[PDB]
Amino acid sequence: AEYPGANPKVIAETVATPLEEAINGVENMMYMKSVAGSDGVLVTTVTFRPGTDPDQAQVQVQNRVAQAEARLPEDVRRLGITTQKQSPTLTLVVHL
Amino acid sequence: AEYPGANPKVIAETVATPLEEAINGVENMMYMKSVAGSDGVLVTTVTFRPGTDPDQAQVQVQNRVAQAEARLPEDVRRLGITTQKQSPTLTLVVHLFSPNGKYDSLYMRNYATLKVKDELARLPGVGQIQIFGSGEYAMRVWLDPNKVAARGLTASDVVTAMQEQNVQVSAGQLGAEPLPQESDFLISINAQGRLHTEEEFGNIILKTAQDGSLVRLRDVARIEMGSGSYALRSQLNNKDAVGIGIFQSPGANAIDLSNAVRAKMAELATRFPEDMQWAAPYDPTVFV
Amino acid sequence: PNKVAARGLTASDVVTAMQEQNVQVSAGQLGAEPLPQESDFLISINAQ
Amino acid sequence: RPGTDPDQAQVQVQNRVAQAEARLPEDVRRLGITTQKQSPTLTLVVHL
Amino acid sequence: FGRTWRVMAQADGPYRESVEDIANLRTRNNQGEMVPIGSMVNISTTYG
Amino acid sequence: PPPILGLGQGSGYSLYIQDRGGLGYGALQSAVNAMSGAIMQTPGMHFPISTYQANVPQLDVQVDRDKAKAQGVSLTELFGTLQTYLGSSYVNDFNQFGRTWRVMAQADGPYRESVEDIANLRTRNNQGEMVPIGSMVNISTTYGPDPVIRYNGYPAADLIGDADPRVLSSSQAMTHLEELSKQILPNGMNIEWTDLSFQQATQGNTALIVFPVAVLLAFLVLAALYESWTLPLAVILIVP
Amino acid sequence: KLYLIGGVKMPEGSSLARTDAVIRKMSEIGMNTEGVDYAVAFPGLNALQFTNTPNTGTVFFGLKPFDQRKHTAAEINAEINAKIAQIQQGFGFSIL
Ligand SMILES: CCCCCCCCCCCCO[C@@H]1O[C@H](CO)[C@@H](O[C@H]2O[C@H](CO)[C@@H](O)[C@H](O)[C@H]2O)[C@H](O)[C@H]1O
Ligand SMILES: CCCCCCCCCCCCO[C@@H]1O[C@H](CO)[C@@H](O[C@H]2O[C@H](CO)[C@@H](O)[C@H](O)[C@H]2O)[C@H](O)[C@H]1O
């Protein structure tokens, strides 16, 4: 999520807490963390039990986030939250 | 769905009806029902053919409500509408209760929200926990219409004052790009405009008087942190209480899970304030 | 549009008028909480 | 491909449109994007 | 308490107990005057 | 680097200290400092590393709403000037190169470099004149964290450290550091494991049943081949 | 099933306070009943829909285990039902 111009504290209190509240209760979530940076960016990582289906995890998390969106500040809504599954399978890195 | 202050009639007409028009035809659905009460809450239950994947059913239903949300009333969707599969098998119901009377159902229910809810839902085997009693905390500003009208003010004026004066805001940084030369320091700026207590809310400025004095919210309203819902009470043994319904996820060990939640409650025992204890009035695993 | 303009009205004017005069409204109820003395009746209010 | 589970395909395509929404114009993201498994096969037609 | 909650604005209970309480709520007209709503509305008993 | 992508260090520990009572960011930083000292003075593990730094300076702009109403400037116009000028404002999208990109409005760099710059941006009052906002704001200095970290819904700080498989294996270094967490501990603040540690902290260890049943199966098929409940041992005891 | 399900419907248009009074009365009736360990009360709860209506209420009588009871749950049901049939304020019931 992006809150352009926001400091870490306002991001944590007005973006991270409502999102964590809407995500908590998703099945097979073993833990989660939230990182709020001075660049106006929040990265929330939800890690699930091993053997979980990452696609079902992603759709459930994204659904809870979508329902929490309305209680988020207007410019954050306008920029749009994104949910995506993180992959560990780095194969190549290419530089220009 | 929630529609604060709405008649069951218009909840059915403008919230239940368009939703139902959207969810109808969903895959494997057996039937759906919609109950709209005078507490402003709509509950729509969609029951599917046995053997249907519950998670798949949930994603399809939320797909259809997502299509539907555009035509719902603004205040309905501003609160959000939640789609969730039901865990049918109850494994244990616990109660937080206050035998003497220090704590009311509001305090105990929100203590459940804050201290035991999250640390129960992460136990190995639960599928769904449910809270029954009072409601979540809410900053209630109880207006007196007569005093509001006396100062030449309207309800809309008061609401716009609360909205304009209770906001966070993003104050940016000092020394960020673009710059003709490299900066030495980066400093973030905080400009807090969010209120945290009843007194600050009461200190909201509404208008200026011919007196020249500042007309304030506490001049025309009683401010409290009360409940967001006054629709359901909970008592255990005629003492104020809040009931927690624990539902296991299919494939779990119900005996082991009930033992686990009981032991967890005994662990949170160390951190309760006095005059608040807990009970398990019903245990359905004993049968097995 | 000729008649709408003849009344000095714009398409936005008529559209917003239609927005403002066909709308659902919530109107609460009489005898609801909080009360210092417990109420006997709860009477829902419908505004259409 | 033939033999692929249409439900898994639906969920994956849905996840990826969800991740791509932030790279689209705001006017599009506002109106929402639908993702349904579907066969273009008109199985029959009923005439009134 | 680390969480987020709604702040709500409503009339205090004792001011929404009667029909006349509804008729007595006031608002602003096109000349700045405070007028009660009872003059422009009809309030009827019904069942539902 | 790590042996794998996605878990953490090699042998060792990943830990999170969280505050459940509201002790504040300074208390968390003192907790992490005292801990890291304790881990260092423990002979095996070196100084642990974290991303938490509560001593990041910043500026707090409080507003005098009384003076705001006295001067006739709206609170939302004040916050709006702060927002657009200092924090940038998202306007809308535009299409170029066949793609869609953001339009951002912000004060140029060298007009948001000093506290006088904050005081110097101007908003309009009810009399319609343009007034500097510095008269109504009180910019002070404070120290906080960047980034703000939360773990399991509570404020928290991470702590990942190197191991000493030649001194203290991770399994009992875990309970060691649990003893330290009880040691350096305020009530309402606790620790929780993450990455491999969480596994080791919460695993329903099954090896202690796979090893027996394995040797049982071996002895049993040996007995079948040997027509004896006593000859198979003559092989099972030669492996150690 | 180690519990009984009792409830009340009050006259249409009643307030939740009246239901609360009636529910408290039947709760204490259940307590003064032998073998009923608990009187779990939810005034405002409609048992058929588990929605909230202002003129209905529910109370579960949590029974003691049989080895400490000396009455069958049907007999507790009959006794509590005869006791709460005396309430004229509304229509109260207790079922298995
Ligand atoms: C004795 C407790 C266990 C009973 C077993 C439940 C089986 C009954 C059929 C299943 C239906 C349960 O339906 C349940 O409705 C209740 C209505 O209070 C909701 O419960 C709600 O209670 C409070 C107060 O109203 C709300 O503020 C809260 O957000 C929500 O938890 C549950 O979210 C829903 O799951
Ligand atoms: C010459 C060019 C070399 C390019 C090398 C690119 C690979 C570099 C990898 C960096 C270190 C790998 O080590 C890895 O670090 C990441 C990032 O913190 C950790 O990742 C952790 O945080 C990330 C960030 O949200 C989570 O998505 C993840 O679930 C969690 O485990 C891994 O647990 C650890 O295994």
Tab-separated table of N, CA and C and ligand atoms in Angstrom, chain B residues 86 90 93 109 128 130-136 229 232 244-245 247, chain G residues 42 45 49-52 60, ligand 1:
chain	number	residue	atom	x	y	z
B	86	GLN	N	-19.039	-20.414	6.733
B	86	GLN	CA	-19.414	-20.760	8.096
B	86	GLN	C	-18.801	-22.092	8.508
B	90	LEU	N	-19.629	-26.584	16.373
B	90	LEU	CA	-19.181	-25.867	17.557
B	90	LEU	C	-18.453	-26.827	18.490
B	93	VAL	N	-18.000	-23.187	23.943
B	93	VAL	CA	-18.407	-21.803	24.160
B	93	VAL	C	-17.868	-21.362	25.517
B	109	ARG	N	-16.556	-7.564	26.352
B	109	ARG	CA	-16.523	-7.919	24.938
B	109	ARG	C	-15.328	-7.289	24.242
B	128	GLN	N	-13.246	-20.935	13.269
B	128	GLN	CA	-13.930	-19.654	13.399
B	128	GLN	C	-14.312	-19.366	14.847
B	130	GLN	N	-16.464	-16.591	17.297
B	130	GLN	CA	-17.541	-15.617	17.200
B	130	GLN	C	-17.762	-14.964	18.555
B	131	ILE	N	-18.025	-13.661	18.535
B	131	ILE	CA	-18.278	-12.887	19.743
B	131	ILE	C	-19.775	-12.632	19.828
B	132	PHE	N	-20.355	-12.854	21.005
B	132	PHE	CA	-21.753	-12.534	21.270
B	132	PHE	C	-21.800	-11.665	22.520
B	133	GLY	N	-22.162	-10.398	22.346
B	133	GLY	CA	-22.349	-9.503	23.470
B	133	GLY	C	-21.959	-8.066	23.196
B	134	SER	N	-22.880	-7.148	23.493
B	134	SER	CA	-22.694	-5.697	23.353
B	134	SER	C	-22.154	-5.409	21.953
B	135	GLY	N	-21.063	-4.663	21.819
B	135	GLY	CA	-20.496	-4.349	20.523
B	135	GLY	C	-19.134	-3.718	20.702
B	136	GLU	N	-18.484	-3.457	19.574
B	136	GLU	CA	-17.160	-2.860	19.610
B	136	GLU	C	-17.241	-1.419	20.097
B	229	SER	N	-23.055	-1.023	18.917
B	229	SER	CA	-24.305	-1.755	18.764
B	229	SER	C	-24.944	-1.948	20.129
B	232	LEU	N	-27.738	-6.477	21.339
B	232	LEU	CA	-27.699	-7.800	21.949
B	232	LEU	C	-26.897	-7.765	23.242
B	244	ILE	N	-18.154	-16.366	23.951
B	244	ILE	CA	-17.265	-16.658	22.831
B	244	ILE	C	-17.637	-18.032	22.300
B	245	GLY	N	-18.019	-18.098	21.026
B	245	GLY	CA	-18.328	-19.353	20.379
B	245	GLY	C	-17.163	-19.818	19.530
B	247	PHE	N	-15.524	-22.575	17.021
B	247	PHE	CA	-15.910	-23.555	16.015
B	247	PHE	C	-14.644	-24.113	15.386
G	42	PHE	N	-28.966	-14.591	26.319
G	42	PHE	CA	-28.796	-13.632	25.231
G	42	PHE	C	-30.161	-13.010	24.966
G	45	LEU	N	-31.657	-12.107	21.130
G	45	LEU	CA	-31.291	-13.128	20.163
G	45	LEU	C	-32.522	-13.924	19.747
G	49	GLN	N	-33.154	-17.590	13.556
G	49	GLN	CA	-32.280	-16.962	12.576
G	49	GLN	C	-30.919	-16.570	13.125
G	50	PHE	N	-30.759	-16.533	14.449
G	50	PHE	CA	-29.571	-15.975	15.100
G	50	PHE	C	-29.305	-14.545	14.636
G	51	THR	N	-30.376	-13.816	14.340
G	51	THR	CA	-30.330	-12.382	14.121
G	51	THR	C	-30.780	-11.675	15.402
G	52	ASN	N	-30.729	-10.345	15.393
G	52	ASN	CA	-31.108	-9.538	16.548
G	52	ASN	C	-32.447	-8.866	16.278
G	60	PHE	N	-29.911	-20.482	27.130
G	60	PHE	CA	-29.579	-21.894	27.203
G	60	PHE	C	-29.328	-22.281	28.652
H	1	LIG	C1	-23.823	-20.239	21.882
H	1	LIG	C2	-22.918	-19.665	20.843
H	1	LIG	C3	-22.756	-20.586	19.673
H	1	LIG	C4	-24.062	-20.807	18.956
H	1	LIG	C5	-23.783	-21.631	17.736
H	1	LIG	C6	-24.008	-20.914	16.445
H	1	LIG	C7	-24.844	-21.776	15.542
H	1	LIG	C8	-25.997	-20.989	15.005
H	1	LIG	C9	-26.013	-20.941	13.512
H	1	LIG	C10	-24.776	-20.255	12.988
H	1	LIG	C11	-25.066	-18.792	12.889
H	1	LIG	C12	-24.129	-17.874	13.620
H	1	LIG	O1	-24.407	-16.578	13.124
H	1	LIG	C13	-23.766	-15.575	13.798
H	1	LIG	O2	-24.668	-14.508	13.984
H	1	LIG	C14	-24.143	-13.651	14.970
H	1	LIG	C15	-25.237	-12.703	15.398
H	1	LIG	O3	-24.974	-12.364	16.697
H	1	LIG	C16	-22.818	-12.944	14.532
H	1	LIG	O4	-22.186	-12.462	15.700
H	1	LIG	C17	-22.018	-11.085	15.846
H	1	LIG	O5	-22.245	-10.725	17.184
H	1	LIG	C18	-22.013	-9.367	17.528
H	1	LIG	C19	-23.285	-8.730	18.085
H	1	LIG	O6	-24.309	-8.839	17.176
H	1	LIG	C20	-21.447	-8.510	16.377
H	1	LIG	O7	-21.089	-7.264	16.855
H	1	LIG	C21	-20.217	-9.261	15.808
H	1	LIG	O8	-19.589	-8.566	14.801
H	1	LIG	C22	-20.599	-10.693	15.363
H	1	LIG	O9	-19.719	-11.615	15.882
H	1	LIG	C23	-21.859	-13.985	13.899
H	1	LIG	O10	-20.868	-13.349	13.203
H	1	LIG	C24	-22.605	-14.993	12.990
H	1	LIG	O11	-21.751	-16.003	12.630
